[PDB]
Design an enzyme around this catalytic site. Sequence first.
Site, PDB file in Angstrom:
ATOM      1  N   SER A 274      55.236  27.400  15.951  1.00 45.21           N
ATOM      2  CA  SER A 274      54.908  27.199  17.350  1.00 45.21           C
ATOM      3  C   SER A 274      55.869  26.165  17.898  1.00 45.21           C
ATOM      4  CB  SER A 274      53.473  26.734  17.536  1.00 45.21           C
ATOM      5  OG  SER A 274      53.214  26.440  18.890  1.00 45.21           O
ATOM      6  N   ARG A 275      56.550  26.502  18.983  1.00 50.78           N
ATOM      7  CA  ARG A 275      57.570  25.622  19.520  1.00 50.78           C
ATOM      8  C   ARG A 275      57.019  24.592  20.484  1.00 50.78           C
ATOM      9  NH1 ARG A 275      61.363  30.738  19.684  1.00 50.78           N
ATOM     10  NH2 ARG A 275      62.879  30.080  18.107  1.00 50.78           N
TER      11      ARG A 275
END
Lengths: 117, 235, 117, 284, 171, 86, 136
Positions: F33-34
Amino acid sequence: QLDPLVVGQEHYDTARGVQSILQRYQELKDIIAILGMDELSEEDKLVVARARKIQRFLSQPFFVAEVFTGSPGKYVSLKDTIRGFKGIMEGEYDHLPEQAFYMVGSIEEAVEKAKKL
Amino acid sequence: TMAEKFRDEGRDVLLFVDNIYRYTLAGTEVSALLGRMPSAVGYQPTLAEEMGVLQERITSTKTGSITSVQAVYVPADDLTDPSPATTFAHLDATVVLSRQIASLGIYPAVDPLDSTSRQLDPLVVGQEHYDTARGVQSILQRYQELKDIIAILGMDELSEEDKLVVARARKIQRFLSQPFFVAEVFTGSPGKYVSLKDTIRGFKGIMEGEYDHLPEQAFYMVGSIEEAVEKAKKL
Amino acid sequence: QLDPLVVGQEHYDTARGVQSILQRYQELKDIIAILGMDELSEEDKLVVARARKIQRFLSQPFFVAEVFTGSPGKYVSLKDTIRGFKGIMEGEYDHLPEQAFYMVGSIEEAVEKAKKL
Amino acid sequence: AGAKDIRSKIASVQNTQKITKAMEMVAASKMRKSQDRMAASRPYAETMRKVIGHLAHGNLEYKHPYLEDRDVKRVGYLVVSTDRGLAGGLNINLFKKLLAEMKTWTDKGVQADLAMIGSKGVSFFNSVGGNVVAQVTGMGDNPSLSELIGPVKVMLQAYDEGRLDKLYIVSNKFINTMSQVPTISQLLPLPASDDDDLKHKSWDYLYEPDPKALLDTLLRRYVESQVYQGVVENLASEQAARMVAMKAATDNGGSLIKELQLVYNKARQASITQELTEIVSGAA
Amino acid sequence: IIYDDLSKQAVAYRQISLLLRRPPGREAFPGDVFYLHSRLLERAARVNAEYVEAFTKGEVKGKTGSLTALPIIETQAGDVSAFVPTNVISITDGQIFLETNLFNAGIRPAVNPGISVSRVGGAAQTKIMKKLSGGIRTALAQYRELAAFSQFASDLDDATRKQLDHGQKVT
Amino acid sequence: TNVISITDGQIFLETNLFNAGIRPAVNPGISVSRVGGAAQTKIMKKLSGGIRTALAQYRELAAFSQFASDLDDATRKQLDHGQKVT
Amino acid sequence: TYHLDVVSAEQQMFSGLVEKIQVTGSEGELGIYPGHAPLLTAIKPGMIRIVKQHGHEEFIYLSGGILEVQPGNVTVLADTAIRGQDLDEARAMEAKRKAEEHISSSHGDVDYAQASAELAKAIAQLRVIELTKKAM
């Protein structure tokens, strides 16, 4: 560009020494796993400690990552980089704990951090 | 077609094709030039017919015959690739040459364990020839593993019947060498042409302890076996 | 339909325990293949034996395969199988040979076939 | 799947095969060394047994506790086990042979007392629930007698103190490079060795200072020596089992490269076909 | 003559061929990528005095001509068995296989023995070099596997302990 | 290969975990997840930092799970904490 | 001359024919010439003198043991370490401790450690048997 004629023997030797320390520490992780730390030589236990410290010292807090972690950024020159890794590999900072190098910036800040610890 | 002309004269002919895989690949190149759709692994759609219409003219006949010795290259070391699989449908025999057999100074370097023929059946070649060949094959492939036990544990571990298998296998492996006429200008020794019956004699001998009493270098490069004894004489 | 709310907690729990054992057996097949079976732990030789029993006990004789093997077909009710697999998974049948389970109906036919070896 | 994964698995099985071949060669060299160190230890026990025989049941006799049976109320075991895995079935055949007989004994109300050589038996019996009272571990392929003095001092002290009635050593016996067999053998009270002194009408020793104090030390040293011999044979047996197990593993890997390569070739051909067909049938 | 990448000529040819709609072959290279490198490298030849004399129409008679060629090929991840590398390996008279694990380790030039060979061999080699160098290649091709086995083995038999360190000197 | 490139994260569900009992079958080692910690309450952000490292060390050691009987006891504890947190 | 054997539990320290030896016995110093009548005694830790045949003298150090003399043969069953009473009781107590406190020490076979770790990593998650369709 990483050859002596273009970076100089100082930078070249520092970089090659760091690489060789980390390579040896990779050789040794799987002996540590099986036979435990207390079985290494007195020469190898120092390679382990310096490899871990070098592996920490490569980290750095960015000025733009401040939004992810809050910790303030650091800019480190090349001179201080070489003077730091050379100093670690030559056994000059064996008195400090590992975490005195983690996310520190310049080497002169590793001692100031270790004093807090 | 030149070979077929010689055959019509009632002769026995020998036709060498220096690489059949390149014949296949030229067929594929031309097929692609003509715009035909690619078949199994990119090979032309007509592969097994372009091969058959060559390989089918090489046959015996009530007047003459053509035998063929064809060098074969197998792509990607894969005997399933359509070209090897299409060629092997036509090959009767198969001789493989090994770098190792040559390393031991044995020529011709025909690997006796992987070389095969489908003329080896008691029906076609007879029972004596068949079982002599199967005998030397079993001897060699047992020696293959005794020579590993030796390399790991040293000779002294082997049972004492195996110390004799390892002495018969070495004599068999030597006796498979031959002086060619064409090989003189390497080996000096004159050439020998060995009639089949004589090979059957020599190996029936070596296999069953006859000629146990004479040294292994009396078989090397000798030719017939009744010259192995007369090379031992002066050894 | 394999939900605690549809098939009850006990059926669901047995089905999932069987899946888990068979999967753990799948993960050992390469170690067993390369190194042979004697390298496994005492708690992973037991998993292998129980999985190899569950595999056989999943087999059944069919009233329509009598044509092929003669053995009379069996009809096994659901209660009589979520009892038998519970039995095998909890080791209460560990004293039997694997072949006692091949092509039988309920678990009592296996405890009986074992007597004949 | 796909060609590029199966080629990586082939590469790693080939690596496994290199490793098992190396372990085979190493184990064979260590086996030869250990079965040299095994024969180098025979003379001491051989001559000490003749001395003990002449002194205990010769032209006369003295009577030590270790020489004469007594009713067995509880028993001791000195268990020899490897320190390293990959030995194949070595340790578990031995431990099950032991457990069967410790069961047979406790079916007669007697207890058992265990002392462990090597850490594999330690980890095992500390989980089956055995009564372990002394242990030594980490000798590896450098067995030394001084490291054994402890765990046998325990058993002897408990024997002549009256708390044991019989003492066994359980270990493997190295017969051939191709066969090893577990054996449980007695070492107290002293087994009969066919040491008949009928040739020794001719003399008796001068004892300095007295024969009983000497006989005591002779028996203790003899027990220590036979425990050491058992350890060294167990070590050579371990090495031979590891050699054969790694031979098996190398053949198992070689016979699996051949499957992976068939699967890889099928995948290669499938990829070529599926690509070229898509191009040619997407044109026009 | 030196061709810097015959593995980039094949890519330019694949492009110019697809843009002409010509039917493709394996790995989408045109039907006849083999006839591309074959007819190129078969120009590198040694040609005898009769040919030079006829061609030059009698102006030079004592000589033979030659044109030796060193094509260069790039392999993905050491995969010598890819479509264009296994083509060109089937045309030339040998290969010098430069191995990356030697290059990173500092062995430069990273000539890998055993895998690399010259098929004309000693016929081309000068007499003194043919004499001195005859034994080297197999000595190294064996030392390089002995140095692999030497990871897992300590206490090496002093018979092999000499071969190791000699191979290491020469390397 | 398109929608992995377009998005801001990936949750990889793996069948070899699903069968073994780990449901939901999220694979933490390959999932990303960025947005990261910016999308968390600060208590969860504080706490999950050590979970990432527990699972990362467990993944680096797990090759030894099938040899655990011979492992040093200093690593055995990491290899078991990884199992408990999984 | 007579044949002398100095052997420990582990290895053979000396052999061959001798002209005389001088040993420190438990009772007192000793000296054995050829034909010496049968004798059996302990010996204290310290040197032993041998004269190899033709007068080549040399000194060996022995930690203890037992001396057995027969008329034409003599053997010295030496020990590897100083053997006393309180020395052995320390070993016994340490061995007893290590059994209750589960202090399982490691071996030192680094070659096996490296080979085993490489073999464990290489075989990890190969999934080979799912990939090729072997039945098993």
